[PDB]
Amino acid sequence: MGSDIDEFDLLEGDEKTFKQRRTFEQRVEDVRLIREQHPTKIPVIIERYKGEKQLPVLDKTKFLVPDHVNMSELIKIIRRRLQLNANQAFFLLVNGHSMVSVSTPISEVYESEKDEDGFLYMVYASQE
């Protein structure tokens, strides 16, 4: 049944991510330097989800966030910089998932979710 149907994979010939722009050792050294001059700030990479067509792009991917800022405030900041409408869905995903704990300091989040290179990576999307 339906055995007469064959499948084909569709190829497409279509601003690289931070990990692609910088080597692992370069990123580690960046984090070391940041740790040295801004010991109360957290280095965060924030990028648009690759497949996201609804939300716009930030022209900046690399951020320093004060330790005390929680995810709620950061979501608000990012939504603000994106100039989103109040009713537009937005998700800030860390290690591929949204944060259950939206009230804790980003330094606390950092200690759990940081990459091996020392950056905390986030991706934003209109789903999850």
Numbering used by the authors: -15 to -2, 4 to 117
Q: Which passages does the manuscript contain on this structure?
A:
L. pneumophila inhibits autophagy by injecting an effector protein called RavZ into the cytoplasm. RavZ functions as a cysteine protease and irreversibly deconjugates mammalian Atg8s from PE to inhibit autophagosome formation. Unlike Atg4 that cleaves the amide bond between terminal glycine and PE, RavZ cleaves the amide bond before glycine. As a consequence, the RavZ-cleaved Atg8 proteins cannot be relipidated, leading to inhibition of autophagy.
To prove whether LIR2 interacts with the LIR-binding site in LC3, we solved two structures of an LIR2-LC3 fusion in two crystallization conditions. Both structures are identical and solved in the same space group. There are two molecules (molecule A and B) of the LIR2-LC3 fusion in one asymmetric unit with LIR2 of each molecule interacting with its symmetry-related LC3 molecule. The hydrophobic interaction of LIR2 with LC3 is conserved and adopts the classical LIR-LC3-binding mode. The first aromatic residue, F29, of LIR2 interacts with the first hydrophobic pocket (HP1) consisting of I23, P32, L53, F108 and the alkyl sidechain of K51 and the second aromatic residue L32 interacts with the second hydrophobic pocket (HP2) consisting of F52, V54, P55, V58, L63 and I66. The salt bridge interactions of residues LIR2E28 with LC3K51 and LIR2D30 with LC3R70 are observed in both structures. F52A mutation led to the reduction of LIR2 binding by about sixfold (Kd = 3.14 µM), while R70A mutation reduced binding affinity about 15-fold (Kd = 8.10 µM). No binding of the free LIR2 peptide with the LIR2-LC3 fusion protein was observed under these conditions, suggesting that the LIR2 peptide competes with the conjugated LIR2 peptide for binding to the LIR-binding site of LC3. Therefore, RavZ recognizes LC3 mainly via its N-terminal LIR2 motif by binding to the LIR-binding site in LC3.
